[PDB]
Amino acid sequence: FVNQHLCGSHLVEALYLVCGERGFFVTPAT
Amino acid sequence: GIVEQCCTSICSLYQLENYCN
């Protein structure tokens, strides 16, 4: 895991690095 | 809410993993 405020893409990367491929749900961003 | 708190701060590792399902 990293540091800094996570608001933005950092939150998704944080969740991916901490929870993994399961843990959160992201809608298709287009 | 928790999203607001994790955003506007240095979100702690356990506050972050609390989101994991």
Side-chain angles (χ1 to χ4, degrees), chain A residues 1-25 27-30, chain B:
Chain A
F1 179 46
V2 294
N3 305 120
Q4 188 164 302
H5 281 50
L6 305 184
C7 217
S9 185
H10 284 188
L11 187 58
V12 181
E13 294 172 280
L15 285 160
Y16 185 76
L17 290 168
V18 180
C19 307
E21 284 270 66
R22 298 177 298 170
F24 67 98
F25 188 96
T27 46
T30 15
Chain B
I2 190 176
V3 181
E4 187 184 7
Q5 294 170 318
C6 192
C7 257
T8 335
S9 196
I10 308 296
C11 200
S12 302
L13 182 61
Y14 54 90
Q15 294 178 302
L16 190 183
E17 63 108 70
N18 216 143
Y19 284 95
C20 309
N21 278 217

